[PDB]
Amino acid sequence: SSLAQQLAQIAANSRSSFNVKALKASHSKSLIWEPRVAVSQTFAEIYSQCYEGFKELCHLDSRFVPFDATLFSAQSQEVDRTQMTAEENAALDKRVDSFLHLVGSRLRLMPAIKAVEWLIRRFRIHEFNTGTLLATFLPYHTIPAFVTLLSILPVQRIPIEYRFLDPYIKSLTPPPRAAIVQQATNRPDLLSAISRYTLDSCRAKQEYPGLISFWGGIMAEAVNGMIDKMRSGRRAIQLENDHLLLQQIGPVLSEAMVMKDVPGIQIASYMVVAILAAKGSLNDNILTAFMEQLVHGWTVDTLRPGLVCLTMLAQHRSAKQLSGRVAKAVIKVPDLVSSLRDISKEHQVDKLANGLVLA
């Protein structure tokens, strides 16, 4: 069956339908309605209902006028993605992902998911942009819209990172956070992809509280579980495992420590590096480096929580002194001893104060 496995690989790589039943099936895989009507649905009334939803969404938020120009047009009726060349498809894919990051905030609502319906039933987004769509609806893991998306995905198209839902796609049921995070523990790459999505969201300034709260829970329990295995007892093994961990968490944690426009992701980065400090027996230089980027990156709304982080950081530090610019910015701190008494009311700030006065 050698040639059979090889043709099977091709059949996986197949995208545009080439026999009448397969055409009907992928044509009828939809979101809002049922397949029995979806098969006797044509683009026109589909464009009508989704355009009504799209005008509702553009009336809610201003920033939908670019895809009013480029992705929600009377020409966006006729354009079939399969018929153009790879660079056209790349530009189209970028337009998709930009709209997805644009639309990720208002997710739980009917006109937005009507827009989603146009995305699928015109642009085959469920097939062509499985990863970004899957991540951008992933933080809604207890709603039936997400359930229906899981219903009509193609299985061999789900990303290797994302192939955890296979029990749930065999048995339709909303998977819980414990499942997603357990895959985050003993599957780093799920965390990698969701980190990349959410940092792109804050870099395009389209972060939103449900997203960042989800991402905080995800990183926190994730790296918690990561250390909860990574403690081994063997000496150089724990050192090297902490090395590999740091390499994995590096870019996202730095971008979120000094993500200056987004205070929520600053707080979440505070959370993950704080747990990284207090649980894991990290080395003082790495700890002070965390301190240094946090010093580099805080704001005044994030001020008091970042102070809590420095209490953690210096409290789990082993040496007695601080390295310079930390003390510089703590001079820049406005209400030092008042905030410090308020936090030491519950937090034991003594090593921080000692490193301060040494510096």
């Binding site: 090889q6 043709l7 059949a11 197949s14 545009s16 026999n19 399969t82 060349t85 790879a86």
Partner: protein, 479 residues
């Protein structure tokens, strides 16, 4: 004038769909015949005119590539650049299937384009449905396979085995062995006349039915083991190439060969013929390949060289062709224009598949997607050449995508229109023309110094007393 476009339309329509020169109307003596034939030729002209008028309704465009700058030549265009060039539709259709450990793979495409059939000479036959990438039959057949081809649809296929010839149905089952055509090394399928054509090593040629199963004609083609075979799908006849380097053109309705053209001095290695019905290109054991018109039986230009005597040739739907020779194959574009009364040699070819130690076994075109299948001893592959294939089809003839309903519809239609195999000729449409000898007998029964020496010399050996020879003797006496 403004009617110059009208007259040019008339000329082009009468050249294209006129189906004949035209009827003379003024030579007619009779009034009823004259006015009725007037209405006839009138309606025929309106027909061809609106045929030209209908010719705009083709959906697709014609595939091509044009070198832009002066240095740019089409046979310096690479295939990954074609991938980055054109759409993901055909990018899901260019690929390679490396079957390694079973010998040089021979491939052929379905007559509709739906399916393809693969055989490895040391045992393998699989038919697979490529666009959805799914296979329906694969069986390793053990015995050495000498040839393979589909039958009239994807229901059945036919294979030249190590002694017998087999017809299988689609899910792998062997419908029947056939022991009537022993030792086939070449197999073709006349597709409209419903006929397998079987050429064996001995020189026996058998036209066998498939729809009712009698062989209609076995012929002792006395000369030579047939080195190669293909068939004309316009006359539906048999172009077979012999070891003397002559090509002979055959038809099931007389034991004699019907044409015997001469080619390269050693055994002509490969043949291929037009589908519109115009020309035929061969490659000889002598390293030259060259073309011939068929309606006029003539070489057009000087013989092209090949750098190795070409093992195969598949000419496309349009004037393009792939010529396969040894370890890499080449594609020419304009080897015979229809409109040009005389043809040209062309210095540079169109595009090639290159030599990386992948010796070709043969080549074929899908008849309806601008792709090219290369069977090589390291498996099957298919690259893309945009000019290939016809652009706009008639589902009345054949659809690349028939349903189950249209499939069974077409099988019953083809069974209704199976064509009695006596009607084979060099002239394809000669039906209803007159018999000269018989019409002379009819008219006769209706209305009712230098040669005489050979006459006497021939009739001096009979020796009937022959009262006509008595008149001849008296006339020779008066001479």
């Amino acid at each position: 004038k403004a009617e110059l476009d009208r007259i040019r339309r008339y000329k082009q329509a009468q050249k294209k769909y006129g189906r004949g020169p035209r009827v003379d109307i003024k030579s007619v003596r009779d009034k009823k015949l004259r006015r009725t034939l007037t209405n006839l030729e009138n309606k025929y002209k309106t027909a061809a005119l609106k045929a030209k008028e209908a010719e705009i309704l083709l959906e697709n465009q014609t595939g091509f590539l044009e070198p832009e700058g002066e240095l740019e030549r089409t046979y310096k265009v690479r295939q990954d650049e074609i991938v980055k060039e054109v759409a993901v539709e055909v990018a899901q259709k260019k690929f390679e299937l490396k079957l390694t450990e079973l010998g040089p793979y021979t491939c052929e495409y379905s007559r509709n384009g739906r399916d393809l059939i693969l055989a490895g000479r040391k045992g393998h036959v699989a038919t697979m449905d490529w666009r959805e990438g799914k296979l329906g039959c694969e069986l390793q057949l053990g015995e050495t396979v000498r040839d393979a081809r589909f039958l009239h649809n994807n229901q059945f296929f036919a294979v030249a085995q190590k002694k017998y010839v087999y017809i299988y149905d689609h899910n792998g089952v062997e419908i029947h062995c056939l022991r009537k055509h022993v030792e086939v090394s070449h197999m073709e399928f006349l597709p409209y006349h419903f006929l397998l054509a079987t050429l064996s090593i001995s020189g026996q040629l058998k036209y066998q039915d498939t729809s009712t199963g009698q062989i209609v004609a076995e012929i002792a083609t006395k000369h030579g083991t047939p080195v190669s075979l293909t068939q004309n799908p316009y006359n539906a006849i048999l172009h077979i190439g012999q070891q003397n380097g002559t090509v002979t053109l055959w038809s099931p309705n007389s034991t004699d060969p019907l044409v015997k053209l001469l080619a390269h001095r050693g055994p002509v290695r490969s043949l291929a013929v037009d589908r519109e019905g115009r020309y035929m290109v061969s490659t000889g054991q002598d390293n030259k390949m060259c073309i011939w018109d068929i309606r006029n039986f003539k070489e057009a230009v000087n013989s092209y060289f090949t750098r190795a005597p070409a093992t195969s040739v598949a000419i496309s739907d349009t004037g393009l062709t792939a010529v396969g020779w040894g370890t890499h194959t080449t594609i020419w574009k304009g080897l015979f224009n229809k409109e040009r009364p005389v043809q040209v040699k062309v210095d540079s070819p169109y595009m090639t598949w290159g030599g990386q130690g992948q010796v070709v076994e043969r080549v074929r075109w899908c008849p309806f997607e601008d792709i090219l299948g290369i069977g090589h001893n390291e498996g099957f592959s298919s690259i893309i050449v945009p000019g290939a294939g016809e652009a706009n089809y008639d589902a009345l003839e054949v659809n690349p995508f028939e349903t189950k309903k249209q499939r069974q519809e077409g099988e019953v239609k083809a069974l209704l229109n199976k064509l009695q195999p006596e009607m084979i000729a060099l002239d394809p449409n000669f039906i209803g023309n007159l018999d000269l000898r018989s019409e002379k007998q009819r008219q006769a029964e209706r209305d009712l110094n230098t040669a005489l020496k050979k006459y006497l010399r021939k009739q001096r050996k009979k020796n009937i007393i022959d009262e006509k020879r008595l008149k001849a003797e008296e006339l020779y006496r008066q001479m």
